[PDB]
From a paper:
Despite the extensive mutations, all these Omicron subvariants still utilize ACE2 as the host receptor. Binding of the receptor-binding domain (RBD) to the peptidase domain (PD) of ACE2 triggers conformational changes in the trimeric S protein, leading to exposure of the fusion peptide and facilitating membrane fusion with host cells. Hence, we characterized the ACE2-bound S protein structures derived from BF.7, BA.2.75, and XBB.1 subvariants.
We then employed single-particle cryo-electron microscopy (cryo-EM) to determine the structures of trimeric S proteins in complex with ACE2-PD. The structures of ACE2-PD in complex with S proteins from BA.2.75, BF.7, and XBB.1 were resolved at overall resolutions of 3.5, 3.9, and 3.9 Å, respectively. For simplicity, these complexes will be referred to as BA.2.75-SA, BF.7-SA, and XBB.1-SA, respectively. These values displayed heterogeneity compared to the WT RBD (12.5 ± 0.04 nM). While the increased affinity of Omicron BA.2.75 and BF.7 subvariants for ACE2 may partially explain their enhanced transmissibility, it does not fully account for the prevalence of the XBB.1 subvariant.
Residue numbers in the entry:
A (entry chain C): 736 to 826, 854 to 930
B (entry chain B): 590 to 621, 640 to 676, 690 to 735
C (entry chain B): 931 to 940, 944 to 1146
D (entry chain C): 1028 to 1076
């Protein structure tokens, strides 16, 4: 908000009278500018949590499990996924102005798809260093160990577990 | 009729005294070389290149500026490198060495007590 | 540790920022003692010298209202800035508990890598943590299998991964390459080898069987 | 949450959904983020001595 243009607004008898109040309008513009600079740091801290922009391999077959509804859609200008397309369809004046965000949401969708391909291809290794590939069934079996289940319970029930994931 | 803020982009007076100017959300045909139209306004005094670097000075809507190519330039920031994991249904990568690293983290705990 | 000392001796912007903010507000408070707010001057010894008491009340009230407004704006913005310093100190108190008096498993809470240990250092109005982490390096690829079939049974590693250097099959631990012969001491058995997908055929060595004989 | 539920596996109870956290996937929303948490839920118990 332009303090002077909201208050006075064009007139000139009002600007000289408002000049008598000191730095009340400089403080308000500083306060609003700090807020706007904080909104970009919010988004940088949530989404730019990845060194490289990782890609999934073309074959796209992770021991079964089916991630097609959450991987990016190549037939789109925005390259969003099917669920990211569902989510985006559900949500000048007297000195007032709206600034645009630093990151487009194409860029945000590109950060999220890289976080997804890091996880589906390397498990948790890309979050601690270089991405180390591992087959998805074996990564799922490592995770079953982390909750205290023995890892043949996964390999002997792989198809059922993959069907339950797909239905959910 | 048109109003908007004016911003000045500078590489720092310890580097140069050249400057670029952003007229915020103003159509670049009604401002009063390099005139460049952005989703964030009209930029004057920077040339638009086709490369893409890491962001230096944030302009907005995906556009950043830098003093590189000097002068001031515009472009679209870089999300990051490009790493391609050689994923397969029977391949694994295992580390053979390690590094010990140490980093810092700074946090404010207090401010000054005034009366 | 020798490089922290160079990089600092040659970065404390978050501590500088809170000092600057407070000074910029205290200066704005004093610089308001010289505005009229719609009066004849900014000095009470000038309204009490060229106005009679019935006329100086009206001019003193215009200053009182302005100065009260400015003081109360100062006091609101300090409450809002202190509520933010409070959350930072609450996070610092949790990091001192969880990274300095313990080893954390939370990812990216005590550095980037695998947390080993943390050291505190005092700063002007805050604290610096030095985080020591482990980072794996220099990876190779091998080929893997989920289980090994032998004598009609399926074997799984007790705490590792089965790997192959091209012709032979070993067990490693998952974060550091150190291959071992597959025996019945580092694997366990469950089931027959036709329900797992990806089983490979290989021999699992029994230590007693030869040694005894 | 993005650090601890997407870049790792969490043992903190209820930080990444109901059940034993297996893994989590992020999706971008307008001005926000959506987390799809995959968890393991035990079922069909029997009693024993
Ligand atoms: C992953 O799941 C999707 C369903 O969400 C599959 O796509 C559907 O497949 C059925 C038949 O299996 C078709 O009738 C639908 O028209 C498909 N929907 C589409 C293409 O949007 C998809 O085939 C699954 N992936 C694999 C590899 O099987
Ligand atoms: C693991 O990495 C370390 C480096 O961090 C290697 O040690 C270095 O070896 C080179 C060549 O022999 C020396 O010039 C350096 O002085 C060594 N560094 C240190 C800190 O001593 C080590 O050889 C690697 N190990 C393996 C098995 O590759
Ligand atoms: C693991 O093996 C893969 C498979 O070859 C290697 O990835 C390939 O590396 C070459 C050369 O760097 C590239 O041209 C290919 O594009 C890569 N991907 C393929 C072939 O899918 C990788 O370098 C190996 N990793 C290690 C650590 O040796
Ligand atoms: C895989 O590792 C094995 C080590 O057990 C290699 O086989 C041995 O290699 C050494 C040196 O070449 C020989 O002295 C041994 O006779 C080999 N056999 C055994 C049973 O130890 C094997 O060459 C490695 N394969 C590859 C492709 O590197
Ligand atoms: C792993 O070993 C088993 C047993 O040695 C193999 O099973 C035999 O496979 C041959 C060829 O398909 C058949 O003629 C036999 O009847 C099988 N015997 C039994 C008991 O199943 C199995 O094929 C081996 N796997 C691989 C990939 O070679
Ligand atoms: C395990 O046994 C207990 C009883 O010891 C079962 O709880 C009983 O459930 C029945 C049927 O709902 C009730 O009529 C009883 O009153 C319950 N017992 C008590 C003491 O309240 C329990 O449902 C059984 N669970 C399983 C999985 O078998
Ligand atoms: C600022 O100026 C000093 C001396 O003129 C120089 O050493 C330093 O590199 C300059 N900083 C930048 C960012 O150019
Ligand atoms: C500025 O005005 C011209 C003339 O109508 C128009 O062609 C152009 O699209 C306008 N700018 C933008 C950003 O639309
Ligand atoms: C950038 O690349 C595009 C490709 O469509 C081209 O048309 C344009 O002229 C290039 N810009 C410059 C400044 O060379
Ligand atoms: C892996 O994929 C190959 C295709 O190249 C296929 O022949 C093989 O059966 C698959 N094995 C597993 C364990 O998925």
């Amino acid at each position: 908000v332009d303090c002077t243009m909201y208050i006075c607004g064009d007139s000139t008898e009002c600007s000289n009278l408002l000049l008598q109040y000191g730095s009340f309008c400089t403080q308000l513009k500083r306060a609003l500018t700090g807020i706007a600079v904080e909104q970009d740091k919010n988004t940088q801290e949530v989404f730019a949590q990845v060194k490289q922009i990782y890609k999934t391999p073309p074959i796209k077959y992770f021991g079964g499990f089916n991630f097609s509804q959450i991987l990016p859609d190549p037939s789109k200008p925005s390259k969003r996924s099917p669920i990211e397309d569902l989510l985006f369809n559900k949500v000048k004046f007297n000195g007032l102005t709206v600034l645009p965000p630093l990151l487009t949401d194409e860029m945000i969708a590109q950060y999220t798809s890289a976080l997804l391909a890091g996880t589906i291809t390397s498990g948790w290794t890309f979050g601690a260093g270089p991405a180390l590939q591992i087959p998805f069934p074996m990564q799922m079996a490592y995770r079953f160990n982390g909750i205290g289940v023995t890892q043949n319970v996964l390999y002997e029930n792989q198809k059922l577990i993959a069907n339950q994931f797909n239905s959910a | 009729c048109s109003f908007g803020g004016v911003s000045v982009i500078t590489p720092g007076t310890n580097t140069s005294n050249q400057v670029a100017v952003l007229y915020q959300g103003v159509n670049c045909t009604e401002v009063p070389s390099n005139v460049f139209q952005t989703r964030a306004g009209c930029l004057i005094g920077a040339e638009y290149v086709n490369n893409s670097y890491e962001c230096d000075i944030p302009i907005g809507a995906g556009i950043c500026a830098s003093y590189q190519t000097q002068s001031i330039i515009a472009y679209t920031m870089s999300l990051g490198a490009e790493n391609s994991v050689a994923y397969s249904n029977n391949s694994i990568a295992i580390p053979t060495n390690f590094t010990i690293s140490v980093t810092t983290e700074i946090l404010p705990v207090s401010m000054t007590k005034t009366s | 540790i020798g490089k922290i000392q160079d990089s600092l001796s040659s970065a404390l912007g978050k501590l500088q920022d809170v000092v600057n903010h407070n000074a910029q507000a205290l200066n704005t408070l004093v610089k308001q003692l010289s505005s009229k707010f719609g009066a004849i001057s900014s000095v009470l010894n000038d309204i009490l010298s060229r106005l009679d008491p019935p006329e100086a009340e009206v001019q003193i009230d215009r200053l009182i209202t302005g100065r009260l407004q400015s003081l109360q704006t100062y006091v609101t913005q300090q409450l809002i800035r202190a509520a933010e310093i409070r959350a930072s100190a609450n996070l610092a108190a949790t990091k001192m508990s969880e990274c300095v008096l313990g080893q954390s498993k939370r990812v990216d809470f005590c550095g980037k890598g695998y947390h080993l240990m943390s050291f505190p250092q005092s700063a002007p109005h805050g604290v610096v943590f030095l985080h020591v982490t482990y980072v794996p390096a220099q990876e190779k690829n091998f080929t893997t299998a989920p289980a090994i079939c032998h004598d009609g049974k399926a074997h799984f590693p007790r705490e590792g991964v089965f790997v192959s250097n091209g012709t032979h099959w070993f067990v490693t631990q998952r974060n550091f390459y150190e291959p071992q012969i597959i025996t019945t001491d580092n694997t366990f058995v469950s089931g027959n080898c036709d329900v797992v997908i990806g089983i490979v055929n290989n021999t699992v060595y029994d230590p007693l069987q030869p040694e005894l004989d």
